[PDB]
Design a binder for this molecule. Structure first.
Ligand code: HEM
Ligand code: HEM
Lengths: 379, 51, 53, 60, 101, 79, 120, 51
């Protein structure tokens, strides 16, 4: 005989992936965010499927549709705010996982890291398209601002922007296209996540120490399944705190006014997850330079494996790199704060210096510091 | 199917019938609780207090 | 107050669900943590001894 | 002498069918009890505001 | 030399591989050259490295550090892998030079 | 490929484990836990904190400077 | 072998749980006959008989006659086997010792989980 | 870049430059063809009839 778990094909795949997968025994709670990310993706898919049963993509009926969900669909407010704040939880976990990979040298898993970069881009696109769907003033004007950035691309910017718009400006066509894309993209994200896990399982999972843990591998089923359930429960606590006590904490009030294309909102600012890229974009005076810098901010992650110069994979045993990494985190927080703030004398200079510091820390300071640490260790 | 009509299989059925009955009881209680089946629940004391 | 009700007709129901969720989380998180500790105690108490020849 | 927890284990927890029976019956009764208790807690916290409290003054 | 040694010792203590009982070569990233160097290690050294790494991983699992008396000293840290890694890198460099021309 | 049987070669490492039901889930959780948390925080704080202190200083300065910028200048209306 | 420890553990624990939950009369008869033959064969020759006498006096305080052994074996039924195997084998924490290439040997939590059946 | 700086690699680049240039031309023609780039296509005699 044979155990069905180990011999049946689908059960074989499932067992290898999450029941008998050799997992490092010293993985910390920063290794719970990724499974939290998958839970967030599933939760977003379900909540959105239930929302879309009541949402209409025509400009005449979109805002009324969202109001219908909030005030008339049974438990509709729960689903709507679960989706809205789940997007924020999604991006929080995404940033935390990017930080974990940066700090512990998980980017050395080149294929997994690059697939993750692709996933990050796809999720950002999904969030931006979703924000336009409610069709509030913020949705319309933020879409107008962000899409207009593509016009900067030389000799094809205008045609590409008009093709995306479906017309001369953001309008019913753009809303319908964004509803379709917002629906389809998450499943592409799920497939990319499957590829991500495949590539990760090829090489295993890096531990906090940065040293190979083949000696101390523990089964995932009797240990990390319960650890991830606990982490998911904590994340659910936070998300439900948002949904049931501060449903509008992370959202701008202006999106509760129907979009008026003839009057701009007093402040046109993107969602909080996009704010650092917005600050970087505003930092560069030239439009094309701003667009290229915004692209490079996310794409600099691709260059992270090459920039590695330390003889040690993880930053746990490298203090100066730890100081630089925490400087980078503070800089990202500063960029978000600046992107939220109006463009004025105090904020403009701070944003420019912060963008310079972000790129400098990633490209120059970190590798030179790693080399200095290598010399100090006599390596 | 003729393979399973023997004394030993009858013994196995006898051994597992109580556990199968317990699983059926679990399923019935779960169905009543999940669907809030008032036909059964209304007879249940201190739960009839609802509705 | 009326305008606040209009904007958020689910205000009181949201508050009730929040109270219930806070109590349920207060119950579950310690118990799930206890389950995780129960499973991980075997590793946490593990004593490893290198005994070369 | 068996303790209360040992009696619980032997009677219900040992065989998973009785374990699930305990789980389900407790689920039904805990739904009832917790909903009742937390509703009472919230109604007390907001006594005199909730419509249910003030419905009598305007009905009939 | 004394000033450089003092700063190096400060870095050694600031990094925590000593606290977990690990030696410096225990913390090297396992690239292909390092993998070959480990493959070439004598059995005693390989076993000692394996146990040190396992103990460090267990300590990190419980978020604990080894008692201060048992911390590896800067003087007594022995670069066991460095000669094998140097030989491996030399062989790789020779092969690359042959490939170049 | 990566399966428990053939992951790595290890020799002469003896591990002693105890059943979960024979050991307490929370042993010395506070008597030992709080000192260990304090030790980890002592180790981390010097590296982690300073950048966020810099952020707080920058944030306060920027907010105060913007508030000052909005404020009226008496000299403009002197004439 | 190094790669067969997990399967062997699965099958051994499965047999334990199968005896505990769903034991059958025919295998009980086979086991009773095996025990009877083992008892009779072992007590053959002066060395085994003398060893049995001394050890029985030390342990049982008396040498249980083969007739008493046969009676006690006859009393055994599928119900008795199920009851005793449940008492000693089911949901009971095991003690495991491993030597050699034992990496595939299941972790203690998994071995303990094998000691009970979710179905039962 | 250190490894790929030698006499052999320079020879290797020379061998593959004719192929790389030809593939680049294939991309150039495909882009102009797919996009119907009137700027480039106007010069071509027969395709010029399109516009
Ligand atoms: C929808 C978005 C994402 C999901 C659902 C997701 C999911 C996961 C999961 C479940 C894991 C394994 C669990 C863990 O290591 O904690 C993982 C690992 C990983 N992910 Fe993600 N991820 C997402 C986005 C990203 C992004 C944006 C990056 C980098 C910019 C990234 C890079 C990584 C890396 C490097 C690992 C390996 C960590 C290690 O080996 O310790 N992922 N991901
Ligand atoms: C990771 C996956 C997803 C993310 C991060 C995301 C993000 C968002 C965000 C931030 C909003 C704005 C909420 C608001 O302004 O109140 C939104 C709205 C919406 N999304 Fe998604 N979404 C995701 C997946 C989906 C899916 C799978 C569907 C449908 C199957 C969907 C359908 C909708 C609908 C109907 C709305 C309108 C809700 C409203 O107007 O309040 N989304 N989404």
């Amino acid at each position: 005989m044979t155990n069905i778990r180990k011999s049946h094909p689908l059960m074989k795949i499932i067992n290898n992936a999450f029941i008998d997968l050799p997992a490092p025994s010293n993985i910390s709670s920063w290794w719970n965010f990724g499974s939290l990310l998958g839970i967030c993706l599933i939760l977003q898919i379900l909540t959105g499927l239930f929302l879309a049963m009541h949402y209409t993509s025509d400009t005449t009926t979109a805002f009324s549709s969202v109001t219908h969900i909030c005030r008339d669909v049974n438990y509709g407010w729960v689903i709507r705010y679960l989706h809205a704040n789940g997007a924020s939880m999604f991006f929080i976990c995404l940033f935390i996982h990017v930080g974990r990979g940066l700090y512990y040298g998980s980017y050395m898993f080149l294929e997994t890291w690059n697939i993750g970069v692709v996933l990050l881009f796809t999720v950002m696109a999904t969030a931006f398209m979703g924000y336009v769907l409610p069709w509030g003033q913020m949705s319309f004007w933020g879409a107008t601002v962000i899409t207009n950035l593509l016009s900067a691309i030389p000799y094809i910017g205008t045609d590409l922007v008009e093709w995306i718009w479906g017309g001369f400006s953001v309008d019913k066509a753009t809303l319908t296209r964004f509803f379709a894309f917002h629906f389809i993209l998450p499943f592409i994200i799920t497939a990319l996540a499957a590829v991500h896990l495949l590539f990760l399982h090829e090489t295993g999972s890096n531990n906090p120490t940065g040293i190979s843990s083949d000696m101390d591998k523990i089964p995932f089923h009797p240990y990390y399944t319960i650890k991830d359930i606990l982490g998911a429960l904590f994340m659910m606590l936070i998300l439900l705190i948002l949904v049931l006590f501060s449903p509008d904490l992370l959202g701008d009030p202006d999106n509760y006014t129907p979009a008026n294309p003839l009057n701009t909102p007093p402040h046109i600012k993107p969602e909080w997850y996009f704010l650092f890229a917005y600050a970087i974009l505003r930092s560069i005076p030239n439009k094309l330079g701003g667009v290229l810098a915004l692209v490079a901010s996310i794409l600099i992650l691709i260059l992270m494996p090459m920039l590695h110069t330390s003889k040690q994979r993880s930053m746990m045993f490298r203090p100066l790199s730890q100081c630089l990494f925490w400087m980078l985190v503070a800089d990202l927080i500063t960029l978000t704060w600046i992107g939220g703030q109006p463009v004025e004398h105090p904020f403009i200079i701070i944003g420019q210096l912060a963008s310079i510091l972000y790129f400098l820390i990633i490209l120059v300071l970190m590798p030179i510091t790693s080399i200095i640490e290598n010399n100090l260790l006599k390596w | 199917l003729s393979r399973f009509l023997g004394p030993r299989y009858r013994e196995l059925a006898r051994n597992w019938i109580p556990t199968a009955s317990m699983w059926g009881a679990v399923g019935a209680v779960g169905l009543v609780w999940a669907t809030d089946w008032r036909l059964i629940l209304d007879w249940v004391p201190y739960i009839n207090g609802k509705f | 107050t009326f305008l606040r009700w209009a904007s958020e007709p689910e205000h009181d129901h949201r508050k009730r669900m929040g109270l219930k969720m806070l109590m349920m989380m207060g119950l579950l998180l310690p118990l799930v943590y206890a389950m995780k500790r129960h499973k991980w105690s075997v590793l946490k108490s593990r004593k490893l001894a290198y005994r070369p020849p | 002498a068996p303790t209360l927890t040992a009696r619980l284990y032997s009677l219900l927890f040992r065989r998973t069918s009785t374990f699930a029976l305990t789980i389900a019956v407790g689920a039904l009764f805990f739904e009832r009890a917790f909903d009742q208790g937390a509703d009472a807690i919230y109604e007390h916290i907001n006594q005199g505001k909730l419509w249910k409290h003030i419905k009598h003054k305007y009905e009939n | 030399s004394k000033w450089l040694e003092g700063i190096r010792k400060w870095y050694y203590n600031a990094a925590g591989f000593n606290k977990l009982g690990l030696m410096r070569d225990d913390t090297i990233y396992e690239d292909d050259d390092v993998k070959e160097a480990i493959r070439r290690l004598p059995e005693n050294l390989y076993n000692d490295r394996v146990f040190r790494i396992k103990r460090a991983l267990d300590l990190t699992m419980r978020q604990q550090i080894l008692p201060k008396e048992q911390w590896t000293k800067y003087e007594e840290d022995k670069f066991y892998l460095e000669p094998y890694l140097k030989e491996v890198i030399r062989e790789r460099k020779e092969r690359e030079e042959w490939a170049k021309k | 490929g990566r399966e428990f049987g053939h992951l790595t070669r290890m020799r002469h490492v003896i591990t002693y484990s105890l059943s979960p039901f024979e050991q307490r889930a929370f042993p010395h959780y506070f008597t030992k836990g709080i000192p260990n948390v304090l030790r980890r925080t002592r180790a981390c704080i010097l590296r982690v904190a300073p950048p966020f202190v810099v952020f707080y200083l920058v944030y306060t300065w920027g907010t105060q400077e913007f508030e000052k910028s909005k404020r009226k200048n008496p000299a403009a209306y002197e004439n | 072998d190094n790669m067969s420890i997990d399967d062997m553990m699965f099958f051994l624990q499965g047999q334990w749980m199968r005896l505990c939950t769903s034991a059958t009369e025919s295998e009980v008869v086979r086991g009773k006959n095996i025990l009877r033959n083992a008892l009779v064969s072992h007590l053959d020759g002066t060395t085994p008989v003398c060893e049995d006498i001394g050890r029985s006096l030390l342990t049982y305080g008396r040498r249980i006659p083969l007739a008493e052994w046969e009676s006690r074996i006859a009393e055994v039924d599928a119900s008795v086997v199920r009851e005793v195997c449940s008492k000693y084998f089911y949901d009971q924490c095991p003690a495991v010792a491993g030597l050699g290439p034992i990496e595939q040997l299941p972790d203690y939590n998994r071995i303990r989980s094998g000691m009970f059946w979710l179905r039962f």
